[PDB]
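ugh ok so i messed up the first submission bc i forgot one of the chains. this is the corrected input, ALL of the components this time, i swear. 1417 residues overall. if the numbers dont match what u have on ur side tell me asap before i send this to the collaborators (the ones from the other lab, u know who)
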Amino acid sequence: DRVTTQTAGNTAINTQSSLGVLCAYVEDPTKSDPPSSSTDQPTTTFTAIDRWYTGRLNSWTKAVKTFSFQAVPLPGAFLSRQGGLNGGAFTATLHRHFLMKCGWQVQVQCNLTQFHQGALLVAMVPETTLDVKEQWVEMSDDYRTGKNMPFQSLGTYYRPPNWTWGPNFINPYQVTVFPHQILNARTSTSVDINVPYIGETPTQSSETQNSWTLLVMVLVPLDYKEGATTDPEITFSVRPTSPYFNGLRNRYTT
Amino acid sequence: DRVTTQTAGNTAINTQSSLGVLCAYVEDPTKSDPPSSSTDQPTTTFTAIDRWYTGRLNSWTKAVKTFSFQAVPLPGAFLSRQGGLNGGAFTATLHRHFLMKCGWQVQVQCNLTQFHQGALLVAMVPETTLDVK
Amino acid sequence: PIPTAPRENSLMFLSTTPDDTVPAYGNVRTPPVNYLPGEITDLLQLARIPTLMAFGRAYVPYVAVPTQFDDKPLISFPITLSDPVYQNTLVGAISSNFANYRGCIQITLTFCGPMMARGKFLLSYSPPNGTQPQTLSEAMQCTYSIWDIGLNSSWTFVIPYISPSDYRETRAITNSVYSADGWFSLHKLTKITLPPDCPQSPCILFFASAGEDYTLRLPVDCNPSYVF
Amino acid sequence: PIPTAPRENSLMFLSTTPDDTVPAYGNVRTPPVNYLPGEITDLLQLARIPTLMAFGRAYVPYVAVPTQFDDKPLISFPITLSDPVYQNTLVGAISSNFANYRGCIQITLTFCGPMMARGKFLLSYSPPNGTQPQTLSEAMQCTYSIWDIGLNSSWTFVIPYISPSDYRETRAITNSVYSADGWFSLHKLTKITLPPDCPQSPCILFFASAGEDYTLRLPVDCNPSYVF
Amino acid sequence: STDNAETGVIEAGNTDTDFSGELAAPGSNHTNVKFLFDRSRLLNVIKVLEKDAVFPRPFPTATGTQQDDGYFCLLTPRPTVASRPATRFGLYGVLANTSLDFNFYSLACFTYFRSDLEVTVVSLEPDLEFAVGWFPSGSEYQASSFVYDQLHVPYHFTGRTPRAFASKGGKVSFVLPWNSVSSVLPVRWGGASKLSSATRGLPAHADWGTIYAFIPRPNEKKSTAVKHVAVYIRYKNARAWCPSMLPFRSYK
Amino acid sequence: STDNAETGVIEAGNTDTDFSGELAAPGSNHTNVKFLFDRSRLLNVIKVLEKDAVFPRPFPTATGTQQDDGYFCLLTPRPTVASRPATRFGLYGVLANTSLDFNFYSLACFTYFRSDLEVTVVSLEPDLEFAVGWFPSGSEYQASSFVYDQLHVPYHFTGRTPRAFASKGGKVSFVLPWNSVSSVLPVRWGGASKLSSATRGLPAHADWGTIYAFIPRPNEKKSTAVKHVAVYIRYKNARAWCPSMLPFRSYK
Amino acid sequence: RGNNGNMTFNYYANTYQNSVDFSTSGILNPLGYLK
Amino acid sequence: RGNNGNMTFNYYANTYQNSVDFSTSGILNPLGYLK
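and heres the new structure output, hopefully the right one now
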């Protein structure tokens, strides 16, 4: 039924309100192949990294508006340790390899009660720059238009143009095209999404890629009568499925 | 003949004066079994640690007397980085595991010339405390 | 030499000729794309994915349900795919780039109140009348379905394809019956009963997907107004 | 007469059309060339022939090995086929007339000291890092091979094709990872032991050939700067 | 019908799911990705070279740099600026040439894209005999000139790349392969093209190359009036991956 | 791997020779000699005859010799000077017309070469109706004129050799065989063409012939403005022998 | 087949007209599966 | 076959289009053999 335990290595995570794992674009997104752009023998999965990594995420309050989101890059949250997400031997393997190729498997836990309302949109969003320059990022007109995405400054030679659009916008009404599940306060306390590797190349650089971004967006604001539990904490669990590390070198220095 | 190259992972070390590998106590000392004193699944060899680690050792002069030795612990030289012997992902795996069980395979390089004399006794010595003050 | 007679439209660049042209830099082997999953073959694979609607109360994907309300629809939007409740749905955005549609619009709701809330809603669809139906009695006489709030938290209302023509215009320029197909309206049948210490005014989150028999025809030029 | 419709690119001279033209002076029997040996069919037959590199100390095909040296590479050149250590190799000159390469660069050394000289060298190749590796410890952690000086006087180091793409740019215009593939570096592991009455500072003569899986793509216009 | 949207999968129903009805017969298939993108549209209006060019220097460009602007068309549906790839798209010192494929991004509901590109270059000048050069993705413009009988002839009359010569009042049309080193074009991108000091969301080599139009006369025959030319592109055999968003249609 | 370079033969190894790796899959074959040379490139810019010519007299030419210079294109990738074969290539009395195939010698890593030549003659003048003559290797230009109805018509309007007439604004393109008496063209040559008083390294008949452009009007219709024309050549079915060097790319 | 009404005759080869991948040696499916 | 995309039809003969020798009656080999 709704009680599933997902063992991965020495890690087993439980939920008793499971909505079923949302597999993205294929039946088994764990099935993956070695990259065709690297002639060396890749480093496949091993039991110290074939596990779940649990980080915290910022609390969800009544003051958090509609479409106010919160983004977790993959594997970008392993590098910067976003939300206390120490990647262990996965990040230790990732800093020593130039290319990395994996799909992901996420679970975002957020336990509400039967007296709470509200909804979260937990989605895996491909190729966004939402970690680049509060507890929650607000959906302004700059995020809806891509107007605030990073750019090369044209210099003093050019007249600086009125920037009006960028392709890494967020249309906040179309975030359910992504591999998503809604974390309703009256159906479930956690959601499961399994995504495969995607990218412009068969394998991408370990330090730079943002092929998947975990996106937790508020669709309905949190509401409760006073006396209930205020500000429930959002946490997430990330499991890399089938990594193909390539290009072994020394640990990454800037 | 005396020209052997020993590939291990991404590491190949050469010698053109090979005396043959002195295998200790058995035919193949690489054949090993998981320990019987640990119920967890062990971490066996993987290609980032299945390799040679090259460290320096102190120079051999005329002032060095007979029986004056120099000791390298295993895996104690991987911990303290004795002689610039950074163990890479082997020491990184060793600091994260409580028990470890391996045999070793060593090669000590020291090129003299046909106008030099002297002898060194390179030996693998079980259970000594020769690294301690 | 073969005697030919070139036609009146010789040396003409027509932008949508169904025909190839000369290769300038041929014999190029591209890197294979067999590693990428999720290949889109048709864009109706994505119109069938339900996306959020938008409702003027700062536009909102949901509808709050006030505890006292008249005999009016709690929300009511016309069945016209150029209406601004459809601008940011993948149905109404893909369909705005075509000229016809054929098939069923699908409205999915999601009750986002507490689990302790009960209640019943009357989800009605009216074909185009002279006057938009407002009373619960007038919405009962149309195509309707009553949705009970309970363990399951959704109801996919499928708007029927009722049309005088095999295709309908996806943009009401002149607001005729070939482009505007009546109204969807959400009435509350019985009021929402909450226990003590539960939030008032729960929210019904709307979606808008395409039916399994939804079809689009005649690609037109875009509206470049998003980039301004 | 056959009705034809000539296209928009009629009467156009494209310099690389994959097609013939009208014979003006046909039916000409050339003298046979079956007497000449060494017919070249592909120019990768000649990129695989190792030719001398050039090293700024009046540029020099070799590298002298000084008797006292720090913990630096004795020579270290980047793996970029537009670098001036490759300008006069047949690899780097044929590849400079193309736009992509794919496969293994091959560096052959030749120790040109006396026969009485011994010594060991660490031939390392680093993939592109943020900082070029200089220490023998940093060069040990990369792709390396130790070459013993002895009866045989060469060592063909094969630089692996480590790349994020199936092809690499053969000219670093913008010095990205698609064009610059890290560094080759020659360290001396143990110092060269000479007997009395032997010349100090012996020379390692470098070569640069193509691997057996080396490939070139997209012929580009030449650099006519040799004729100036 | 009774459903759960928190599942993340909602089955597309019909009239017969709840009501008494039937399926509509499927009329067309015009939403086919290989069909819907296989049509020409105006990409960019660039100017015609009358002499050899100086290609625009990389960003940030300082004042006083004598370069040649508005001459090169970077063949991408993504936003470009000053014949170089951009991330933000701008419009209105030197007014930088910006381009964006308006028809593409209103239907680019996907993350990755790959096609063969059919470039058509239409003259916007009365009775112009122009000539179109092209150099591939990750290549660069050859910028000098050689003297043939006391006439500076630029090096973009020759090369191993296509140079298509038009007739007087004619047009230029040829199809280009997917020449980039990437497997697909990132419609949206989240990574960086360099390890140090790179811009996020800016792909290095997501293009079918760069074209430029030139007048097939030497540099001494340079006129004064600036001649413009229009660039139309068609996506042949278009394939799309990984469903994504469409831009925010505002309500004001 | 352990090798000897003094052998003179070094086997091209792969990653799996010493290291753990594999072979890269062979992508292209663009280094094919028959493919890589089968593309047009600018050979020479010659002028257009408005009257009958006097072919340039052999070297050394003294002052005061009334001859006609810059009019004939000696079809060779080798250096030519004054429509005659050269050994040294020069650039800048009378300024002599020098030509060299820049694209050829940067990839002429071989000693001998033979192909069929595809000559394309493109006008460098606005709306020119010109005409291209050609005479084979080891032949010579016919230099006089005949009077047709009080009009001096030169003898290069007729002959048993190709004369290709262009339209007004058109081009001329035709393929030529290997017509020389030599079996192959010496890219590099070490011999002499005569037993006594010859120049070393100078082949006598290493060419596909000589072209010239003329205006198809009689000598009385001679204008004043000098008209120029461009010569493009393509090597059809190119074969190469005996591997050799590529030119010295300087380091300054 | 795209926006191609040609059913008769392709003049150029499939490698010249199109660009085919290299090797490493109706029914519209859902883009997401509930497992 | 060179830079020739024609697979269908040659209009002129092989002796007119090309120039063939007269008679006197993939695998890339090395250009030098160690014997």
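quick check: Chain E has one domain: 1-252. that seems consistent at least. The helical segments of chain E are 15-18, 33-36, 102-105.
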